[PDB]
Coordinates of C-alpha atoms and ligand atoms in Angstrom, one line a residue:
Chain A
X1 CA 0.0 0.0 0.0
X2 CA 0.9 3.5 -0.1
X3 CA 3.2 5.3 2.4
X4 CA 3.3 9.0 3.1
X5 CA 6.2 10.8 4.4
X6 CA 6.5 14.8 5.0
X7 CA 8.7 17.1 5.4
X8 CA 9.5 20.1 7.1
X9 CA 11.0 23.4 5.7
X10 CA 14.7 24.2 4.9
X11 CA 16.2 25.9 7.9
X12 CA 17.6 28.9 5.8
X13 CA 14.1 29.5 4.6
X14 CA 12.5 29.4 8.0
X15 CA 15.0 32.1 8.8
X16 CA 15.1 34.4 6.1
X17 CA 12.3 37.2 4.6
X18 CA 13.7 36.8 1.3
X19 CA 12.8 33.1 1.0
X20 CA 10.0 30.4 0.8
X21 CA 9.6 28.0 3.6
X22 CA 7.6 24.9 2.4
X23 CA 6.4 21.8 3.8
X24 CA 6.0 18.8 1.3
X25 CA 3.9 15.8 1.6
X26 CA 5.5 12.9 -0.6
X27 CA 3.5 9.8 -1.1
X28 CA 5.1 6.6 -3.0
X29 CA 4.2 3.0 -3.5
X30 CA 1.1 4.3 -5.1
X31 CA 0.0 1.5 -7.6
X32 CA -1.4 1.6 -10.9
X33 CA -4.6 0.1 -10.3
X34 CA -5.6 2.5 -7.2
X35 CA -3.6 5.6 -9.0
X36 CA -5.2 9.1 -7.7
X37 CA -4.3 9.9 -4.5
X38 CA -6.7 13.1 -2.7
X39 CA -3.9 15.6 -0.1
X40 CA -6.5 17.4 2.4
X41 CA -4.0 20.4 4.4
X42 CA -4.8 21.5 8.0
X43 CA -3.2 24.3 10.0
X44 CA -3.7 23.5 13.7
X45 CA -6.9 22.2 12.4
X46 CA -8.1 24.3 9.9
X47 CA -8.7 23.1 6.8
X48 CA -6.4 25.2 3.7
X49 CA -6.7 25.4 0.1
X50 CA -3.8 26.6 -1.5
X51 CA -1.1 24.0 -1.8
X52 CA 0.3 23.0 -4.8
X53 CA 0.1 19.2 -5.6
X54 CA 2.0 17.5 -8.7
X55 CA 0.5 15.4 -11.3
X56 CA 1.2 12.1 -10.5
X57 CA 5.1 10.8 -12.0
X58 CA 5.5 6.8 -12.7
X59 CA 9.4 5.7 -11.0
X60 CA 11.6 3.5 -12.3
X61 CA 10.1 0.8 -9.8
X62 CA 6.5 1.0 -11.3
X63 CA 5.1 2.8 -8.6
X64 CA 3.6 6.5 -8.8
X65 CA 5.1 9.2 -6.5
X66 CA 2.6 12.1 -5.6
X67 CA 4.1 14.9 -4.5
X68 CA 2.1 18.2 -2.6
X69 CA 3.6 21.4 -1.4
X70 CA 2.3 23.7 0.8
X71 CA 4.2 27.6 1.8
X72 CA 4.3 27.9 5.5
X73 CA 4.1 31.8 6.5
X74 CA 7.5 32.4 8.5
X75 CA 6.3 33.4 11.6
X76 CA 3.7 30.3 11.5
X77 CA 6.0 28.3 11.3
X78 CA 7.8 30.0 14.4
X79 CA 5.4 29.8 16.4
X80 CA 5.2 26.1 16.3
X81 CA 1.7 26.0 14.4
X82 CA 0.9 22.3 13.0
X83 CA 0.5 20.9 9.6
X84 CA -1.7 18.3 9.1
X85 CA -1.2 16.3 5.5
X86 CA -4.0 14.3 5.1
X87 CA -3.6 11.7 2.2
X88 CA -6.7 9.4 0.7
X89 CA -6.5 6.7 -1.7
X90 CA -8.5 3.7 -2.3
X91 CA -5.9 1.0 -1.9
X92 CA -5.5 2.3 2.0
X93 CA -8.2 0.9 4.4
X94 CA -8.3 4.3 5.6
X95 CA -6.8 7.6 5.0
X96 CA -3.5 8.3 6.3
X97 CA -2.7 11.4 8.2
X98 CA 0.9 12.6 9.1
X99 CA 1.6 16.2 11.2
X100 CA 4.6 18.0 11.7
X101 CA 5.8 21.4 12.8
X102 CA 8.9 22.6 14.5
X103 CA 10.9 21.0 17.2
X104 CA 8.8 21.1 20.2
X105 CA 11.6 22.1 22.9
X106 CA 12.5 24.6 25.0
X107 CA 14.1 27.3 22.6
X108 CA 17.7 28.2 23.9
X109 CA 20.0 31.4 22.3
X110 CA 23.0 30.1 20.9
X111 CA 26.5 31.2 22.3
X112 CA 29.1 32.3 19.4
X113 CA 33.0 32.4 19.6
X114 CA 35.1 33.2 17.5
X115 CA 39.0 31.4 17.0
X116 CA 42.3 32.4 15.5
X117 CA 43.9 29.9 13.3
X118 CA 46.1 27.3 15.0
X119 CA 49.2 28.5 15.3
X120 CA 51.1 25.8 13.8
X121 CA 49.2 26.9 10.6
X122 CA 50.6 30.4 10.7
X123 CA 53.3 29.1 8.3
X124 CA 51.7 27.4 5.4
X125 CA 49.9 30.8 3.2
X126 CA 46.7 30.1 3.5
X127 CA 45.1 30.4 7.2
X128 CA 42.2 28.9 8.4
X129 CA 39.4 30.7 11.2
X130 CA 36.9 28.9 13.3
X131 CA 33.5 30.2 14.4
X132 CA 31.9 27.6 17.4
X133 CA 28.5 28.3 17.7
X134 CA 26.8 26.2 20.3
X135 CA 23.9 25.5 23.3
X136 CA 21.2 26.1 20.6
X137 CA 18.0 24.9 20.3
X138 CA 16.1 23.7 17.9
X139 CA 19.3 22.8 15.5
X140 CA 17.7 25.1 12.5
X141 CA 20.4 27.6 12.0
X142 CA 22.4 30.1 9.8
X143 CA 26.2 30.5 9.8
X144 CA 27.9 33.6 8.0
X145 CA 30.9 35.3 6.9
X146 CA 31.8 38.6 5.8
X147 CA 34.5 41.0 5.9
X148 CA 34.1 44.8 6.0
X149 CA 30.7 44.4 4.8
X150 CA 30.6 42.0 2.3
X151 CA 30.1 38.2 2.2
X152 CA 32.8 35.7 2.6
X153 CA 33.5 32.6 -0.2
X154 CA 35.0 29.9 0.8
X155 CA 33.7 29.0 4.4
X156 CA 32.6 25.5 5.3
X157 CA 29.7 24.9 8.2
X158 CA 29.5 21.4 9.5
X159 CA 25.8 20.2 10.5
X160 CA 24.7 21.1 13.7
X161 CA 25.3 17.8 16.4
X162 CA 23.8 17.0 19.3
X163 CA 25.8 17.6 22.6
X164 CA 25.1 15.8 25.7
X165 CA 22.9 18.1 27.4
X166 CA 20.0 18.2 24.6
X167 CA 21.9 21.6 23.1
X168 CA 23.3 21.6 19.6
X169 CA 26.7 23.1 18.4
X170 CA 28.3 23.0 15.2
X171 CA 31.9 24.9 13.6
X172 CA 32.6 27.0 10.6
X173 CA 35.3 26.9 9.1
X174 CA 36.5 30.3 6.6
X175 CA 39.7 30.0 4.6
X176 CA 41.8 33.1 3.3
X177 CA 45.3 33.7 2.6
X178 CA 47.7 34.4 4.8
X179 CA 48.6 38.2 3.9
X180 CA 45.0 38.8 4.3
X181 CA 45.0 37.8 8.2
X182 CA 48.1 39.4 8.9
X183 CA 47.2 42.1 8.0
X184 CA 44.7 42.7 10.4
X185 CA 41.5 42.6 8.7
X186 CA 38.2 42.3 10.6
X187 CA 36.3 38.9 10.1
X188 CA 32.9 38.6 11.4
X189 CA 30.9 35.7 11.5
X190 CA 26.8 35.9 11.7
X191 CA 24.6 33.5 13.4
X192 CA 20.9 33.6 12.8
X193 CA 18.5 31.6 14.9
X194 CA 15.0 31.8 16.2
X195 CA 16.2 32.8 19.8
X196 CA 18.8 35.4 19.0
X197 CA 17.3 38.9 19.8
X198 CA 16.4 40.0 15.8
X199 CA 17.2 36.7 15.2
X200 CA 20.3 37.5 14.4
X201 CA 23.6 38.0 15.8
X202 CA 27.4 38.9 14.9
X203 CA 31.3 38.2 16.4
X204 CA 34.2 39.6 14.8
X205 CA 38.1 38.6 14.5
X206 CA 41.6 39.9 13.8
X207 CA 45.3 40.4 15.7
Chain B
X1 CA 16.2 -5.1 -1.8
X2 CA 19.9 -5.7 -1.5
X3 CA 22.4 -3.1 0.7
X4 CA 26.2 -3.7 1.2
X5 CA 27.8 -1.8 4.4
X6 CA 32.0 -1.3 5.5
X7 CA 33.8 -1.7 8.4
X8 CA 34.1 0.6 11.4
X9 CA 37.5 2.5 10.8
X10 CA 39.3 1.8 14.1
X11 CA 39.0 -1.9 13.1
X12 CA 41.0 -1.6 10.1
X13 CA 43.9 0.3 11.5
X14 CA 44.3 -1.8 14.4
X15 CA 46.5 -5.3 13.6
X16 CA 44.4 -6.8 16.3
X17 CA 41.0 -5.3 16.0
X18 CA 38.6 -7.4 13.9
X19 CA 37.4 -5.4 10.2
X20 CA 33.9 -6.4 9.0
X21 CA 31.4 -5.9 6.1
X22 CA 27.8 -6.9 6.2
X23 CA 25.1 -7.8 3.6
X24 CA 22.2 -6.8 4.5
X25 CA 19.3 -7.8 2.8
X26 CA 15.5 -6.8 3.8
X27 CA 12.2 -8.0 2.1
X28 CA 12.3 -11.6 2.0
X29 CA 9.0 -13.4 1.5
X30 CA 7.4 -16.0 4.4
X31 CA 6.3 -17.3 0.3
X32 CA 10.0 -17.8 -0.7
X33 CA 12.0 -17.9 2.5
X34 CA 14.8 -19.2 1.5
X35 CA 18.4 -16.9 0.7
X36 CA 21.6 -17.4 -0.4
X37 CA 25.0 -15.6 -0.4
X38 CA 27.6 -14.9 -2.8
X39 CA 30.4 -12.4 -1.9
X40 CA 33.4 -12.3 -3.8
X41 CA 36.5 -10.3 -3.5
X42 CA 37.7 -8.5 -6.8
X43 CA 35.5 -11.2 -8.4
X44 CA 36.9 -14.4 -7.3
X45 CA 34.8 -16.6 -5.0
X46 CA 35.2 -17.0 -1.2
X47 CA 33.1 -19.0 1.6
X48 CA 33.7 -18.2 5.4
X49 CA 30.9 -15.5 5.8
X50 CA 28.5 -16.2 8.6
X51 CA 25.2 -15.6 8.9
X52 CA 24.1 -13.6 12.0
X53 CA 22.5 -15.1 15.4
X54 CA 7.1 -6.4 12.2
X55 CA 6.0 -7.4 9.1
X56 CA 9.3 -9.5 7.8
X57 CA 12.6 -10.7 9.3
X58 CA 15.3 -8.8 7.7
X59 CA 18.3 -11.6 7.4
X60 CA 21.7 -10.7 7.9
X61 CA 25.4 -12.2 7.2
X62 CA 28.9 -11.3 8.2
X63 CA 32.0 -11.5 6.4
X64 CA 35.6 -10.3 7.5
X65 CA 38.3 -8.6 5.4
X66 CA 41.5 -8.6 5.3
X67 CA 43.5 -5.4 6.3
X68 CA 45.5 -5.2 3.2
X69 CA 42.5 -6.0 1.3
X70 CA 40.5 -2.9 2.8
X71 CA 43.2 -0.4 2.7
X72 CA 43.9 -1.4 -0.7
X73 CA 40.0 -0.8 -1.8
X74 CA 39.4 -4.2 -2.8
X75 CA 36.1 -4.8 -4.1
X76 CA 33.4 -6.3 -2.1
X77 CA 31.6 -8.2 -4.4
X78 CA 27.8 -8.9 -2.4
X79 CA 25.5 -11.7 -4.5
X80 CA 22.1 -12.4 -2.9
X81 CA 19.5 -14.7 -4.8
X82 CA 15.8 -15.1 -4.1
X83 CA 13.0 -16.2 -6.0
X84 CA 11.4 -12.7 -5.7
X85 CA 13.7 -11.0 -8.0
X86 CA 14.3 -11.0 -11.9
X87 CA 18.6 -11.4 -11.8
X88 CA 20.4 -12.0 -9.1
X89 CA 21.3 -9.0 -7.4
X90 CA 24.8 -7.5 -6.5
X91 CA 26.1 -4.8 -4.4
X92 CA 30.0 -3.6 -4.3
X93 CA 32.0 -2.1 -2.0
X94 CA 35.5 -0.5 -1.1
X95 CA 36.8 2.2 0.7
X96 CA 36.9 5.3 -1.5
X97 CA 39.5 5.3 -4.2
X98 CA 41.8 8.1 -4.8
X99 CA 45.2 9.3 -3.3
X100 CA 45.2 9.0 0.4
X101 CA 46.1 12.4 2.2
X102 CA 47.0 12.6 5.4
X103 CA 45.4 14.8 8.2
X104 CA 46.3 18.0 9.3
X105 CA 45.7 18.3 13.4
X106 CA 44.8 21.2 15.5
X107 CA 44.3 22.1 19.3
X108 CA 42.7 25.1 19.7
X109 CA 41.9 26.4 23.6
X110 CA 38.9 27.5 24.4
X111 CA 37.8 31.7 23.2
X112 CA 38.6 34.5 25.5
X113 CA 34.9 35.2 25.7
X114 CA 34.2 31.3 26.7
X115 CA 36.5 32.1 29.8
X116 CA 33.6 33.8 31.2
X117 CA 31.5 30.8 31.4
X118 CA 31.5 28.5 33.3
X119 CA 32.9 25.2 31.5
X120 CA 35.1 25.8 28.4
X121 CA 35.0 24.4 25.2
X122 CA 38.7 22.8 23.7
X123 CA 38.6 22.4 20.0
X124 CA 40.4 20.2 17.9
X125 CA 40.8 21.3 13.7
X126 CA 41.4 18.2 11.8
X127 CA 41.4 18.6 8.2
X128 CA 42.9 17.8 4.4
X129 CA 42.1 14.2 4.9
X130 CA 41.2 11.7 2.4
X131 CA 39.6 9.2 2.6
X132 CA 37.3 10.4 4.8
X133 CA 37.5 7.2 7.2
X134 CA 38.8 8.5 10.6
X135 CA 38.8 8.3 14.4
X136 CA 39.2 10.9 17.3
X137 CA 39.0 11.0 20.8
X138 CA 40.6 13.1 24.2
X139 CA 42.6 11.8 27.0
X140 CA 44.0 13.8 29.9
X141 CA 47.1 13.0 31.8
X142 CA 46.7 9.4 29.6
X143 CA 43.4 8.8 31.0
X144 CA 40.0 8.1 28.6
X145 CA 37.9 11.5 28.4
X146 CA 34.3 11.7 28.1
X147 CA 32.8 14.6 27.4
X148 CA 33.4 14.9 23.8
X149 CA 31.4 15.2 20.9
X150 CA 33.1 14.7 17.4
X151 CA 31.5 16.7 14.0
X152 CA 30.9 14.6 11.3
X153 CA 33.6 14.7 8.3
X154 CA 32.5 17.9 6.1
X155 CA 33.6 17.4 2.0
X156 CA 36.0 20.2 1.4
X157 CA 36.3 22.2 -2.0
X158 CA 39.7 20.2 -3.2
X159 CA 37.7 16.8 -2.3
X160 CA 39.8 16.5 1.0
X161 CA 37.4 16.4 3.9
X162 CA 38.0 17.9 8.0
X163 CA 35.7 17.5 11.2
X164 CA 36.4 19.5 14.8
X165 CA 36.2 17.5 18.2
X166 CA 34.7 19.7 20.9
X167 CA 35.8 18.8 24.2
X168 CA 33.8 20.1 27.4
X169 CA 35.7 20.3 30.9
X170 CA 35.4 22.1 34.0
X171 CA 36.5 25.3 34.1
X172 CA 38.9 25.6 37.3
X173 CA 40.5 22.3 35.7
X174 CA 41.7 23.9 32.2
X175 CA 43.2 27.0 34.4
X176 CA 45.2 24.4 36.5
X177 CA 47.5 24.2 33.8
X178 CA 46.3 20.5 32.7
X179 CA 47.8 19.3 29.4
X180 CA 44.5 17.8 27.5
X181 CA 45.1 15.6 24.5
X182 CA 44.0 15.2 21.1
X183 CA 43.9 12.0 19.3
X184 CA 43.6 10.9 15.6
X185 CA 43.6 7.7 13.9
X186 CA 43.8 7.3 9.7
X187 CA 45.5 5.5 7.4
X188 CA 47.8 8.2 5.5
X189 CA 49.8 9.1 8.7
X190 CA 52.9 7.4 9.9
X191 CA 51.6 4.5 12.7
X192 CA 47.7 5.6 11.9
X193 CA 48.4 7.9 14.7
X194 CA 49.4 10.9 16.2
X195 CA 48.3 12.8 18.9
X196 CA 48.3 16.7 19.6
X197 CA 48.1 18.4 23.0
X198 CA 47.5 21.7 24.8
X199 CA 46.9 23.4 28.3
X200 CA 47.0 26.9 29.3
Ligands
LIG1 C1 10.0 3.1 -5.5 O1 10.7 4.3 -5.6 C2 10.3 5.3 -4.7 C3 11.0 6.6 -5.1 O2 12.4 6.4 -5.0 C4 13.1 6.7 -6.2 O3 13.0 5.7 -7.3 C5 13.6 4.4 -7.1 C6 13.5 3.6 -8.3 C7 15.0 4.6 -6.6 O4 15.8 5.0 -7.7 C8 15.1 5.6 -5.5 O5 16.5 5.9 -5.2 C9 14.6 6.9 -5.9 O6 14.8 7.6 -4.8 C10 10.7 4.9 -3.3 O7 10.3 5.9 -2.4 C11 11.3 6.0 -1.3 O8 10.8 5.3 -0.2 C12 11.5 5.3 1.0 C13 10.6 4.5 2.0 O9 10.5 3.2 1.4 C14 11.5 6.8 1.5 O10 12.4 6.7 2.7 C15 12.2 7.7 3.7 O11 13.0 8.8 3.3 C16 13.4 9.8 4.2 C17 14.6 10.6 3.6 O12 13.9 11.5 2.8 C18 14.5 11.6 1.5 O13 15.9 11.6 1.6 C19 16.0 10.5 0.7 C20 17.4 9.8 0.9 O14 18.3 10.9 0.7 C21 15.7 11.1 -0.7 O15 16.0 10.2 -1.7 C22 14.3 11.5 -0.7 O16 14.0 12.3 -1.9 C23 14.0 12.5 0.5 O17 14.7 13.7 0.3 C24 14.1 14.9 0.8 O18 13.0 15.2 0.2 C25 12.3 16.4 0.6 C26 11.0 16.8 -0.2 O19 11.2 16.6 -1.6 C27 13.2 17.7 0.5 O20 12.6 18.7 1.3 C28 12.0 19.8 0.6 O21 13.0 20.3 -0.3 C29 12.7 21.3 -1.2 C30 13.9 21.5 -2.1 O22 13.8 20.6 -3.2 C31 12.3 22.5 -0.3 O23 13.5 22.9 0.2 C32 11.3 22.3 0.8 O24 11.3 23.3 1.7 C33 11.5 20.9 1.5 O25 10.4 20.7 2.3 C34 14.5 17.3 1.2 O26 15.4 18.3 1.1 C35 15.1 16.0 0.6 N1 16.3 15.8 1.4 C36 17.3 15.2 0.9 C37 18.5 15.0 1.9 O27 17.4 14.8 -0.3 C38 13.5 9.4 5.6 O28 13.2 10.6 6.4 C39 12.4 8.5 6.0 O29 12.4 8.3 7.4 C40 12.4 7.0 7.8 O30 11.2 6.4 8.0 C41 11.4 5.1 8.2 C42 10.1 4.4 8.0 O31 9.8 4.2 6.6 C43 12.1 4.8 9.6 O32 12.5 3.5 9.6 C44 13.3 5.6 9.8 O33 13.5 5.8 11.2 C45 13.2 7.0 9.1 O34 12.8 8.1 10.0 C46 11.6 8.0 10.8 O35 10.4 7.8 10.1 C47 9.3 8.2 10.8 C48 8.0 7.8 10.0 O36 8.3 6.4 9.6 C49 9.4 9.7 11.0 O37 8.1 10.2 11.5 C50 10.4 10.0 12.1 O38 10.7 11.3 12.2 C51 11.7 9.1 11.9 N2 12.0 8.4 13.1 C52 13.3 8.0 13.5 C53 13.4 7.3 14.8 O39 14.3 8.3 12.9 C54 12.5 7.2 5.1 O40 13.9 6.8 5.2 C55 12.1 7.6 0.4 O41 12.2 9.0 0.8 C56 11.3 7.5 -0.9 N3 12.0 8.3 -1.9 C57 11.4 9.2 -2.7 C58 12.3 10.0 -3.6 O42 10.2 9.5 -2.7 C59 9.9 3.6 -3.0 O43 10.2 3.1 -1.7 C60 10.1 2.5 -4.1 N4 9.1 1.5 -3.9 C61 9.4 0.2 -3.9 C62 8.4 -0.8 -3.6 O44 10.6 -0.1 -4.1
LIG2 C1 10.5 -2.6 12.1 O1 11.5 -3.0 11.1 C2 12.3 -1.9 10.7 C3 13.3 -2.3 9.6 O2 12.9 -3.5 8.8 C4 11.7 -3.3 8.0 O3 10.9 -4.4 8.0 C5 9.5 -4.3 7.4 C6 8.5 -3.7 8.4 C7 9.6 -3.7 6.0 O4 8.8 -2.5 6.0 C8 11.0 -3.4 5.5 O5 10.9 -2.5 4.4 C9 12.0 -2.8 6.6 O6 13.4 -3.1 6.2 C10 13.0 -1.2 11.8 O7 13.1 0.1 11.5 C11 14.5 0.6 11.2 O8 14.9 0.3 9.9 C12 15.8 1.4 9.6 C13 15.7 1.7 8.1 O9 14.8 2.8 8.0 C14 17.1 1.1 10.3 O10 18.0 2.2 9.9 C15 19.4 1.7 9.7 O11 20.4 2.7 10.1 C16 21.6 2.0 10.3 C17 22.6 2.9 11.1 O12 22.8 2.3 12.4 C18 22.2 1.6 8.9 O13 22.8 0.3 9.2 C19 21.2 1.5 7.7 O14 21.6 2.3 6.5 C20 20.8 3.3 5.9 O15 19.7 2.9 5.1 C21 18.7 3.9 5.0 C22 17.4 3.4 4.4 O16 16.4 3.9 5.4 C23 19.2 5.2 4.3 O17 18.3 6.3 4.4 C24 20.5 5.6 5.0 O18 21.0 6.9 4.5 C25 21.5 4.4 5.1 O19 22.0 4.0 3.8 C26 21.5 4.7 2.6 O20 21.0 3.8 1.6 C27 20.2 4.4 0.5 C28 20.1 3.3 -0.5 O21 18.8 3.4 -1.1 C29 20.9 5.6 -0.1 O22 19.9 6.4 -0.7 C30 21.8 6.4 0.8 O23 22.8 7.1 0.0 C31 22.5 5.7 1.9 N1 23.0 6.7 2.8 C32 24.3 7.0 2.9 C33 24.6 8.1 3.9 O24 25.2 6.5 2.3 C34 19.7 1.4 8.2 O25 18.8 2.1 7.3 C35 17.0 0.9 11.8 O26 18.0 0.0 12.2 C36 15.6 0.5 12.3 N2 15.1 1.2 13.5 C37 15.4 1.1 14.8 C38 14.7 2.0 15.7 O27 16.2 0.3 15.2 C39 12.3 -1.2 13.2 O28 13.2 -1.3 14.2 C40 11.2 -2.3 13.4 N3 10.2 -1.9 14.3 C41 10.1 -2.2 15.6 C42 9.0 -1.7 16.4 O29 10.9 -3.0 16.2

């Protein structure tokens, strides 16, 4: 029979005004002779209109996958409201119904530090600068960096991880050459998450 | 529905430890119950795996690999046969090819705004390694540490890969001058090993 499985929204949308945070109900395993499958769409229990399903598209297993996507306002979202997918189809003895919104815990502001390169590094000419950011809660986050201004390139963010106390904390990692450290230059790395003040917040390194 | 999984790194840089695969298949009919196993090595025939102790069981099997064959990517040929599927169906394995490069390793203490806490955070920057099979962990004084969580390996933009290990301690411990230890296992290194170490 059908399963359903549904997903929540990219972290960087949830935290940005610019983009589009979406939840998506994905159904598979949907069979040929039992092909149309109905998507109702409830926000803590009120019935919407104005998701977007997919025509159905046949895998290369010979099942159909049926796809439906639905734009969470930001601040919904926030506010741990609920999305209901409800999914029909005649091949289930009844429908199926799947919910999801944020993490429920106990939001917690994340703490950012900022660290000079190793100073075994200080040799080789290209240097390498580590933002921490950690004790945050839930693990959707943004990680940043810019120089007088303007955005940084090459920077590398590893996923957040769970530490032992129910916290998350992850590093970044933002490559330049050396010249361009030693010659003390201001590098600032931004953090946005729900629980920051603005959501947003900023620490800044040099000499 | 066939899946073939590798060993757990520490096992194959350890002359002692013991490096294992495992052929898992799931989906196996109470209609046709009945499985069986060919894994071959570079596509030559060997028989010494075993064959571990809701809806369906999901059967197992266990094979062990050499530690020259592993670190020199042999192919793990998996061959599981049912009467449930159109071919006979094969998975393959190996570490991931390429030129190994070693590890770079890096203590960092904890940030001057951290000292205002009230446990600090030791870091340790490992990165440029290839393959991405590796192993960290802290000891103080040579003594196992346990408050330590370990990134996962992030892909870096010249294919090499790098984690950080965050360490946690009390805080009047770091400031009585106690050397803390950083230590990192992978193949490309002289010995698989090295450690790094700082304190105050
Ligand atoms: C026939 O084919 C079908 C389609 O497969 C394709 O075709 C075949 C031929 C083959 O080529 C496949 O490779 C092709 O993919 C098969 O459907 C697949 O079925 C399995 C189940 O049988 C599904 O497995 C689940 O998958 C998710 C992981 O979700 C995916 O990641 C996978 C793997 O990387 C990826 O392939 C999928 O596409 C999903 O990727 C994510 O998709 C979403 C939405 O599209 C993206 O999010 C959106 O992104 C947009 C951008 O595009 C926007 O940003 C938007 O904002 C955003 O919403 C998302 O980015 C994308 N992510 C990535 C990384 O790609 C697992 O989560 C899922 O969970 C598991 O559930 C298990 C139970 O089944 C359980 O055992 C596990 O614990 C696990 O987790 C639990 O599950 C609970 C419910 O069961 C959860 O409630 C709970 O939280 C959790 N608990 C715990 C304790 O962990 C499961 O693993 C698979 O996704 C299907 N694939 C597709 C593409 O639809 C079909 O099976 C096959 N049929 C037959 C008979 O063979
Ligand atoms: C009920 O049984 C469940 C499993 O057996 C099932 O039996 C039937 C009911 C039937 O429906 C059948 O289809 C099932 O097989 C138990 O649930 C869990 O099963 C999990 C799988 O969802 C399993 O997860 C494993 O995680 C371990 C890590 O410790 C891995 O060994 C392993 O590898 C992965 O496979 C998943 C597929 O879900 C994939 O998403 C992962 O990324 C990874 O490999 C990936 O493979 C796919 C290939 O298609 C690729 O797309 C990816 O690239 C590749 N990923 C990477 C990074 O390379 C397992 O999946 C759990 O062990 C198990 N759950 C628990 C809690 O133990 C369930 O336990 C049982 N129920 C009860 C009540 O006991």
């Amino acid at each position: 029979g059908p399963s359903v499985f549904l997903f929540p929204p990219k972290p960087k949308d949830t935290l940005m005004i610019s983009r589009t945070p979406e939840v998506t109900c994905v159904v598979v395993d949907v069979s040929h002779e039992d092909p149309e499958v109905k998507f109702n769409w409830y926000v803590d229990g009120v019935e919407v209109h104005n998701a977007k399903t997919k025509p159905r598209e046949e895998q290369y297993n010979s099942t159909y996958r049926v796809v439906s996507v639905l734009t969470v306002l930001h601040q919904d979202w926030l506010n741990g409201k609920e999305y209901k997918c409800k999914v029909s189809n005649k091949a289930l003895p009844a429908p199926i119904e799947k919910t999801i919104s944020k993490a429920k815990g106990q939001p917690r502001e994340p703490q950012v530090y900022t660290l000079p390169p190793c100073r075994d590094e200080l040799t080789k000419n290209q240097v390498s600068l580590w933002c921490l950011v950690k004790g945050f809660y839930p693990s959707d986050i943004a990680v940043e960096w810019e120089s007088n201004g303007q955005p940084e390139n090459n920077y590398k963010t590893t996923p957040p991880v769970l530490d032992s106390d129910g916290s998350f904390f992850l590093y970044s990692k933002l490559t330049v050459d050396k010249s361009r450290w030693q010659q003390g230059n201001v590098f600032s790395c931004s953090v946005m998450h729900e629980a920051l003040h603005n959501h947003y917040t900023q620490k800044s390194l040099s000499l």
